[PDB]
Amino acid sequence: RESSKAAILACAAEYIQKLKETDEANIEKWTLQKLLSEQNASQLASANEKLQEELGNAYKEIEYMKRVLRKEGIEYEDMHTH
Amino acid sequence: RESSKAAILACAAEYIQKLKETDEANIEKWTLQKLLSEQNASQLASANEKLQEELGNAYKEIEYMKRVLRKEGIEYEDM
Amino acid sequence: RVERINGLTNLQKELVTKYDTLPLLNMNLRLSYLRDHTYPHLQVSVQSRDRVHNDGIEVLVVNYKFCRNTMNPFEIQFKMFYKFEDSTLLKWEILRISTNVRLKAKQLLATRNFQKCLLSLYEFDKIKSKKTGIFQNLINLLKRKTRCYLMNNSDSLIVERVIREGRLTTIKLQINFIITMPGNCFLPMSKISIALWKGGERFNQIDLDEICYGLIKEYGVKTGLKEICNVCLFPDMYAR
Amino acid sequence: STSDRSELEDYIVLENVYRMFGITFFPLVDPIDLKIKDASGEIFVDREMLGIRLEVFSERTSQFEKPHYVLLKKRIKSNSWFLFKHTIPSFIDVQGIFDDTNGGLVISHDDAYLFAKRVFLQLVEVQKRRQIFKDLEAKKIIHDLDLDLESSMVSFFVKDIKVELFVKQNEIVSCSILDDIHDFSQNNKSKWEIALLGSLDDLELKLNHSFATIFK
Amino acid sequence: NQQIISVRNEIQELKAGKDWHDLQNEQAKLNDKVKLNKRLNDLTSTLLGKYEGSQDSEDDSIRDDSNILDIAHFVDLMDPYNGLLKKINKINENLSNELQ
Amino acid sequence: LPQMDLKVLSEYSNLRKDLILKCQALQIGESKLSDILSQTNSINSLTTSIKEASEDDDISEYFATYNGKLVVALEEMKLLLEEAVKTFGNSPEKREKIKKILSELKK
Amino acid sequence: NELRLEDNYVPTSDTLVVFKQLMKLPVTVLYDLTLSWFAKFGGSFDGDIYLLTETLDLLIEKGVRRNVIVNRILYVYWPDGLNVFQLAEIDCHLMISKPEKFKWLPSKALRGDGKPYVVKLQPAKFIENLQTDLAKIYHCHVYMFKHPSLPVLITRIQLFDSNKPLISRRPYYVAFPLNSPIIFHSVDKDIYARLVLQSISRTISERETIIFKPVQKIPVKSIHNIMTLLGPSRFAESMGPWECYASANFERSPLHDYKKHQGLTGKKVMVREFDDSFLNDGKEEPEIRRLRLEKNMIKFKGSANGVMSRYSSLVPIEKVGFTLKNEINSRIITIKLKFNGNDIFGGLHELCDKNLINIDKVPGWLAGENGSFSGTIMNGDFQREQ
Amino acid sequence: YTYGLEPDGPVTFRNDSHELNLMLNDPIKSTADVRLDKEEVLSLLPSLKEYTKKSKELKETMGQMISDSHEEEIKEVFVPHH
Amino acid sequence: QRLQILDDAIQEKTSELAEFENMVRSPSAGDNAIPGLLQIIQSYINLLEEN
């Protein structure tokens, strides 16, 4: 707020210009966020699928151990039951 | 462009108000889209960490399977 | 009219006749403000108030109790002599000090200033409570996922995870919080450090210090510790 | 009766014990914000206000110094306090600390305590340096000295030479010797100020050690 | 003289500009971020076992954190007041009082 | 200071190298000295605690027979617990001992 | 560049103007300056110090009129002219004698974006750098003197022109408090005002850019009063009704006795009517009259006794203009108030004593709070004028 | 946080640092592409090597007494943690 | 000069650390007795759990 007329006019012009550049910065930042969100989503999906296939391989190894022990014929116990 | 100064000032005021309103609307819609994206990321990460916990349990199981055969002492042939 | 008010008067009657900027006279309200808000979990008790009529010296015994930790609180008793009409402190001494805090309190009580000792003790208790809360949060987050055990008497935390890329490899990460009592400044202080072992081989200390300092500075301590516990413990998932 | 005098005295004793800590919150209301809704003749405050007391103990004087008051008022359109009035001198920027604390937007008494603590440490720093300088003056290792309101600038004579010090905080960050005895070498000038650089607490021992070798 | 004063005022205003300070701070922050990202990538590569930069063995003795931990633990164990033997003793008299 | 006939160029470059290296050595000197001061406070507090609690101004025999004090206390505690268990289940005594151990772990 | 002036240059100042400067100074101070003047630069008197101090003592013995001794020091001791150092001495002594005749304006020093910069002025280093920065353009001569009863360091700067003797211009005074970002300087709008003030900012910084921002636009006299108003003191930011907090006399030390604590004694108060009975109007009781008169003093002086006839405030101010903006029915209502006088807040106090103004409904800013600052008020918050 | 549409991290860190009186090992300032060497720094201050040797001896010394005390066994048998 | 003064200050501190180290050293062989007592305490804890 200014009491002088010319000061009011100059401040109005500066405010209008600042609003314009603020809008430009806002749209640029919106584009950047739009890129970042999809990048993160794709990375997380790839991580999830890789970790799931690792789990599948672990289950296959567990089955291999299990029927190797069954071939050996020794009695078996499960720690989720103990 | 206008001739009378009063029209110039009124148009400047309307321009300022329109710019502020447009900025507010854009912020609101972008915030809504941000919320949707965050929800999607969280809901996928929950399943990711759950299956990671399952994987850790499976690793504990396979570690116990490995240490069973050394207690008994039968030789093991790797794949 | 003309009304007479004092400390014991009702709050409403004092508000009716309030036309100055002086602090309120309601002593109950002042005590509540000093107890519930300024210094929570501090049970103070003025044990007695004795006098020596020959020299005008007042004897006061004050007992302090810190109740931030429900189990094992540490209490300290203070005795001080000050002149009656002149606000000068003659001498003060510690009548008794709790054993569980005596070592960390000796060097602080060596300095001849009661105010510094009280402030340092209160801040030390607050920092200990904060550290315990952080440890509880981290344990609850990392429990039932990796095998973790706590030692150094609640000073360091060790987390162990078995990561397999076709063979058994264990990654060991140590996080420790150190609280050192001054005895520069007069307030208790804390320090952060990390140490990572990957299957028996120790990582370079400079780069780990840099990563810890970074993540903590740009993410805070609460989220920074969680981020640190992610990257070393689960490097495979972040790589994809 | 006289009993209410007794528990009023007890409450005052407890309040003084609390004031021994040095940081306290006290209630405050301004007469202009008091209004009556006229529903039942009830008086309610419009804008809440909180006051903070800061007292610093001086070991040299064995007396409590004059308290400093800072007051916080609540905005109408927001739930955040703003710095209404204060008595802290100008050389301490209370407004800068208020904006620094939580990036502004103080909402809880825990956040308000942190702001009051930060401004409290600098007050003790001012007193400690003045106390050390006055202790040196009493010990008479140095001559008459001049001190500003923050005890940063100082100038005194050790034996006959003008030595002045600049301190940003407890550590001495600058030294100078501003006298020309007609037996002095420039090499000796540098090796003395560098030695004198250090903390404020070891100045007493160092002044005796450095200036006893010159007259031996 | 008028232009001398004007140009000197312009010097002062340009050198004391807020945008200049903001740009300096932004440059410093971005350099710090770049360095942190590079070090994070190096650490992740080292942990995964591929593209090693060094980081597999300790080479610095200028900073060892474990000294303070070891001495603090020793102080805690050797406490005349809160030591292990003092705790065991207090257990002894507690049991004696419980069963007298 | 920015780095910059080869006479002064080379000597100035290496001297600037040497001086920036020296000052970074000085600030790591702050690191070393601060760590040493804090650790000295720790060790001095321990030794003065034991020295005031010794009452005879030497602790060599204290360190020597610390372990012996341990074992004797433990195995007499063994007979104490054996008698208590024989006398009764001592649920309250067991709870008190567990709470005391928890307090010891806390501090 | 030997454009600087030594302490022996003799400008061709008029005899009449320097005659009027010695007019205002008392007799007892003229004797002191003359003795010190001869000990530094001598004079045309054909005698030693003892001979000079003998005859000068005799002028006191006879009760000699000051016009004789003023003519003696202007036409006998120094007929040729007056030294620049002598002119500086008479100017500073007139400054001390009549501190109400000089006006001052506040200015703030800023470093970086918005961090205030506290000034630490070295009496020596601040001189030569200013001389170097000023003599490259114009002839420069400076003089520094410390206030006898105030911590400020008043500096006077005079600039000379060639149009051959040099022609003196109007001196520029800049007052430096010990440790405060606020710097008080005199009022001037000439070629020399923007050349002296700008040179000071570059000189005092010496490591980083420092800019000066005018805090106020209305000058205030009485350099003693401006220090309490804006300098480093407890009374700043706690004026008006809150002056009781500046001098913590209402609260005792925690170590002090607790019977004298005002909790036991309490305070004597009167009930204020929240219903509007001021518009319509019975003779008041003298006790009620005393309490009614006490309410007015509490809200303008801060205490029943008064921090400081009785209507004079702590710091008198000349012109303050407020602007009140409020939102009613989704539109802004603006009221502008302009005050003019000798003591604005003292004048409002008297009108409240004559029952012309209700004392309950006056706001804080009208009562003296954040005085000497005029600006817009919204939502109960005061904003200073940009 | 920095370049997106919506600084919470740095603010929280500053709050925590002022709350807990935290220290962090500040890295050596930007040397403008100058590598921090080690062996000549150690040679410049041989007291560093002396302190390193003394601290190594101290750490080796405490370990034997810690093992002899068998304090960890008593703590484990008294209170288990998981 | 500054580095030299820092160096001998650190040297004095290292001398103090060495004088402290020269006192704690002592031979001990009670580890077996401590382990036996720990086994007895484990049996005692089992008995208490039974009780």
Curated annotation (Swiss-Prot), chain A:
The gene is CBF1. The chain holds residues 252 to 333 of 351 of the full protein. It comes from Saccharomyces cerevisiae (strain ATCC 204508 / S288c) (Baker's yeast). It comes from the Eukaryota. Binds DNA as a dimer. Associates with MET4 to form a heteromeric complex which also includes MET28. It is found in: Nucleus; Mitochondrion; Chromosome, Centromere. This is Centromere-binding protein 1. Present with 6890 molecules/cell in log phase SD medium. The lineage of its organism: Eukaryota, Fungi, Dikarya, Ascomycota, Saccharomycotina. Required for chromosome stability and methionine prototrophy. It is involved in chromosomal segregation. Binds to a highly conserved DNA sequence (5'-RTCACRTG-3'), called CDEI, found in centromeres and in several promoters. DNA-binding activity is enhanced by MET28. Required as an auxiliary factor for transcriptional activation of sulfur metabolism together with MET4 and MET28.
Swiss-Prot record, chain D:
The keyword Coiled coil applies. GO terms for cellular component: COMA complex; kinetochore. It comes from the Eukaryota. Keywords: Cell cycle, Cell division, Centromere, Chromosome, Coiled coil, Kinetochore, Meiosis, Mitosis, Nucleus, Phosphoprotein. GO terms for biological process: attachment of spindle microtubules to kinetochore; cell division; centromere complex assembly; establishment of mitotic sister chromatid cohesion; negative regulation of meiotic DNA double-strand break formation involved in reciprocal meiotic recombination; protein localization to chromosome, centromeric region. It is found in: Nucleus; Chromosome, Centromere, Kinetochore. Component of the kinetochore, a multiprotein complex that assembles on centromeric DNA and attaches chromosomes to spindle microtubules, mediating chromosome segregation and sister chromatid segregation during meiosis and mitosis. Component of the inner kinetochore COMA complex, which connects centromere-associated proteins and the outer kinetochore. COMA interacts with other inner kinetochore proteins to form the inner kinetochore constitutive centromere-associated network (CCAN), which serves as a structural platform for outer kinetochore assembly. Present with 952 molecules/cell in log phase SD medium. Belongs to the CENP-O/MCM21 family. This is Inner kinetochore subunit MCM21. The chain holds residues 153 to 368 of 368 of the full protein.
Swiss-Prot record, chain F:
It is found in: Nucleus; Chromosome, Centromere, Kinetochore. Component of the kinetochore, a multiprotein complex that assembles on centromeric DNA and attaches chromosomes to spindle microtubules, mediating chromosome segregation and sister chromatid segregation during meiosis and mitosis. Component of the inner kinetochore constitutive centromere-associated network (CCAN), which serves as a structural platform for outer kinetochore assembly. Its main location: nucleus. The gene is NKP1. This is Inner kinetochore subunit NKP1. Component of the inner kinetochore constitutive centromere-associated network (CCAN) (also known as central kinetochore CTF19 complex in yeast), which is composed of at least AME1, CHL4, CNN1, CTF3, CTF19, IML3, MCM16, MCM21, MCM22, MHF1, MHF2, MIF2, NKP1, NKP2, OKP1 and WIP1. NKP1 interacts directly with OKP1 and AME1. Belongs to the NKP1 family. The chain holds residues 120 to 238 of 238 of the full protein. The keyword Nucleus applies. GO terms for biological process: attachment of spindle microtubules to kinetochore; cell division; meiotic cell cycle. Coiled coil: none annotated. Keywords: Cell cycle, Cell division, Centromere, Chromosome, Kinetochore, Meiosis, Mitosis, Nucleus, Phosphoprotein. The modification Phosphoserine is found at residue 91. It comes from Saccharomyces cerevisiae (strain ATCC 204508 / S288c) (Baker's yeast). One of its GO terms (cellular component) is nucleus.
From Swiss-Prot, chain H:
The keyword Cell cycle applies. This is Inner kinetochore subunit OKP1. Residues 41-82 are annotated as: Interaction with NKP1-NKP2. Present with 2688 molecules/cell in log phase SD medium. Component of the kinetochore, a multiprotein complex that assembles on centromeric DNA and attaches chromosomes to spindle microtubules, mediating chromosome segregation and sister chromatid segregation during meiosis and mitosis. Component of the inner kinetochore COMA complex, which connects centromere-associated proteins and the outer kinetochore. COMA interacts with other inner kinetochore proteins to form the inner kinetochore constitutive centromere-associated network (CCAN), which serves as a structural platform for outer kinetochore assembly. Residues 7-28 are annotated as: CTF19-MCM21 binding motif. The keyword Cell cycle applies. Component of the heterotetrameric kinetochore subcomplex COMA, which consists of AME1, CTF19, MCM21 and OKP1. The COMA subcomplex is part of a larger constitutive centromere-associated network (CCAN) (also known as central kinetochore CTF19 complex in yeast), which is composed of at least AME1, CHL4, CNN1, CTF3, CTF19, IML3, MCM16, MCM21, MCM22, MHF1, MHF2, MIF2, NKP1, NKP2, OKP1 and WIP1. COMA binds the centromeric nucleosome-binding protein MIF2, and to the outer kinetochore MIND subcomplex. OKP1 interacts directly with AME1, with an NKP1-NKP2 dimer, and with CTF19-MCM21. It comes from the Eukaryota.
